């Protein structure tokens, strides 16, 4: 049964009201997709509202990509979305995590010049 793929896809597309309706009907927020990726991992990092709704319903912020070991905070930092990064950190997203190539969230942010994010992460440390 495919409500796990419907929740991940809606999160990936930033479709807040579709995520909300799926969660309300009992779609499990920590169910992985075909690539073993959870909604919080595949979500449109531009949508802090999707992130908060996932977390309100019990999504875990620290789940790692089973290959890359990228966490949600790595992608939020790499794409420069401070709002989503704050929501994730507030919920318990560890900022001291390294991906497969030994990069921290603050590394991804600095390398691309996402200064609002890099400053937030340097201060939170």
């Amino acid at each position: 049964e495919p409500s796990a793929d419907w929740l991940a896809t809606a999160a990936a597309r930033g479709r807040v009201e579709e995520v909300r309706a799926l969660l309300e009907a009992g779609a499990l927020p920590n169910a992985p997709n075909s690539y073993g990726r959870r909604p919080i991992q595949v979500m449109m990092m531009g949508s802090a509202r999707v992130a908060e709704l996932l977390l309100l319903h019990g999504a875990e912020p620290n789940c790692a990509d089973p290959a890359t070991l990228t966490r949600p905070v790595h992608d939020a930092a790499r794409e420069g979305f401070l709002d989503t990064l704050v929501v994730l950190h507030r919920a318990g997203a560890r900022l001291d995590v390294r991906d497969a190539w030994g990069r921290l969230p603050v590394d991804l942010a600095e390398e691309l010049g996402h200064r609002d994010v890099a400053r937030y992460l340097r201060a939170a440390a």
């Epitope: 920590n30 309100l56 019990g58 912020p61 950190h89 507030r90 919920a91 318990g92 560890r94 900022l95």
Partner: nanobody, 122 residues
Framework: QVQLVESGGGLVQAGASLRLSCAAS??????????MGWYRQAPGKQRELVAA????????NYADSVKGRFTISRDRAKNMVYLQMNSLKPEDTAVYYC?????????????WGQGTQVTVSS
């Protein structure tokens, strides 16, 4: 604002168990989306984070000194954070505080409740 009230402490002998409760009221919204932790301040020592838990309740961080003796948990529906304290040692003697724990690490805040005194005698 979030109002946190702490209970469960008092006097035990070494080897004993306690269960601390932190109950949230007010912006229980803010509480439900927030990582929470149990902090302790021993006499003559700096306040330290001993246990932290994600919003979701399924992911935890512990100080190595309490890891495996203390379990943090939460009841998302009741707006509660618990610390089950097993195998208590005299060095666990402290005032225990619940607060936010962003990133499962220590908050920087001037907003603390009264805490709950835990005294472990030999």
């Amino acid at each position: 604002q979030v109002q946190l009230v702490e209970s469960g402490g008092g006097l035990v002998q070494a080897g004993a168990s306690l269960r601390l409760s932190c109950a949230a009221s007010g912006s229980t919204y803010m509480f439900s989306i927030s990582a929470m932790g149990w902090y302790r301040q021993a006499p003559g020592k700096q306040r330290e984070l001993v246990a932290a838990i994600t919003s979701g309740g399924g992911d935890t961080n512990y100080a190595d000194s309490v890891k495996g003796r203390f379990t943090i948990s939460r009841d998302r529906a009741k707006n509660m954070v618990y610390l089950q304290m097993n195998s208590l040692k005299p060095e666990d003697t402290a005032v225990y505080y619940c607060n936010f724990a962003p990133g499962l690490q220590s908050v920087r805040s001037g907003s603390w409740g009264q805490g709950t005194q835990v005294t472990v005698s030999s």
